[PDB]
Amino acid sequence: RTVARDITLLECVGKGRYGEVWRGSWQGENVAVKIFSSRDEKSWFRETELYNTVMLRHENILGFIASDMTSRHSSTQLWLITHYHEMGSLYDYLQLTTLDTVSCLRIVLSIASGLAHLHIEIFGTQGKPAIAHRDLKSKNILVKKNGQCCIADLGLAVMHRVGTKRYMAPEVLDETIQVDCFDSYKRVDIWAFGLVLWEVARRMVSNGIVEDYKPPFYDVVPNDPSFEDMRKVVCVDQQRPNIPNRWFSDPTLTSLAKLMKECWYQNPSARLTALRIKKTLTKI
Ligand SMILES: COc1cc(-c2cncc(-c3ccc(C4CCN(C)CC4)cc3)c2C)cc(OC)c1OC
Ligand SMILES: COc1cc(-c2cncc(-c3ccc(C4CCN(C)CC4)cc3)c2C)cc(OC)c1OC
Numbered sequence: 001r002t003v004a005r006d007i008t009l010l011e012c013v014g015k016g017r018y019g020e021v022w023r024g025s026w027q028g029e030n031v032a033v034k035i036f037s038s039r040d041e042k043s044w045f046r047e048t049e050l051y052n053t054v055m056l057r058h059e060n061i062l063g064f065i066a067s068d069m070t071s072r073h074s075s076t077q078l079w080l081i082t083h084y085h086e087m088g089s090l091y092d093y094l095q096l097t098t099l100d101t102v103s104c105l106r107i108v109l110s111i112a113s114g115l116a117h118l119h120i121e122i123f124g125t126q127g128k129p130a131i132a133h134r135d136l137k138s139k140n141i142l143v144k145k146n147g148q149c150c151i152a153d154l155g156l157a158v159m160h161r162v163g164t165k166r167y168m169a170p171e172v173l174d175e176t177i178q179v180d181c182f183d184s185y186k187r188v189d190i191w192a193f194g195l196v197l198w199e200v201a202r203r204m205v206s207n208g209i210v211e212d213y214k215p216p217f218y219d220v221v222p223n224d225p226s227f228e229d230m231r232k233v234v235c236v237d238q239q240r241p242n243i244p245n246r247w248f249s250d251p252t253l254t255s256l257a258k259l260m261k262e263c264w265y266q267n268p269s270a271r272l273t274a275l276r277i278k279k280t281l282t283k284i
């Protein structure tokens, strides 16, 4: 038998500290190829150990194809291969596109479905450990053609500090997080989910009105904010993203505002669960 292992790299769709993502081809089929920098090599190891422990399969989790370590000439290449989503990140999609009730709710409910699946322990040989993502953000969510999203990048994921500073929960920023308690990392995911909810809601049209794309805390921190910039805003001043007046003239945005507030409590144990959010979004 021949093992057809030739992947053609076609175009780079992302470059960063993490390394690079490429649109690739494997046997006519579109694949996404992440090439890790030496700087991010631990993320390849952590994600490969996760998938070697539990082979995640969910419509709202980026679909795993392969982890490859190759010997280059003097160096080790680390590759992650996943399904390819031509529409790109939620971050990219929201920049140019506005949403209606249906497309807005489809997006946020699919993210909550994916996050609930990560979070839940399922018992049995066909089951899974509970997983906290710890790096949820709009760049780590991909849009599918059927209008649902999938959660990506399990490089920081933990099975039962780190992440993007702009999305870090206050207990992470002020280092009060109960590091030994697995529920702590679920609570950090809910915080970041609340912020993504905010980024999506802004782009949903109501009464002829929409806000432009902005990242969380765009009005109170610079680009590439420092730990200290984030700690002062989120922990010391306890600021939270603005809810515009126009959202209170729409039933959906009014419900989404309530949900994001219940993601943003300074007290982590006061925050909604992914499962409670999935239910509330299904009712909206
Ligand atoms: C090594 O590397 C890559 C390989 C492949 C790939 C290509 N053809 C066939 C295969 C294959 C899978 C599974 C079996 C089974 C058959 C039943 N038996 C009981 C156990 C073994 C055999 C063959 C693979 C794995 C794709 C890749 O990525 C898209 C690879 O990564 C570069
Ligand atoms: C990694 O990814 C892809 C792999 C393949 C692929 C290529 N050759 C053989 C296989 C295979 C055959 C059979 C078994 C089973 C069935 C029986 N059982 C008792 C033992 C094991 C497993 C694997 C696959 C899965 C195709 C793909 O897509 C067209 C892949 O994705 C891009």
Ligand SMILES: COc1cc(-c2cncc(-c3ccc(C4CCN(C)CC4)cc3)c2C)cc(OC)c1OC
Pocket (backbone or CB within 6 Å): 013, 014, 021, 032, 033, 034, 080, 081, 082, 083, 084, 085, 086, 087, 088, 089, 092, 139, 140, 141, 142, 152, 153, 154
């Ligand atoms: C976040 O994380 C990972 C993501 C992906 C991934 C999967 N599908 C599609 C993409 C993608 C395609 C295209 C654009 C843009 C670029 C050009 N512009 C004109 C609009 C489109 C953006 C994004 C990505 C980045 C793969 C990964 O690993 C293999 C990731 O890491 C786990």
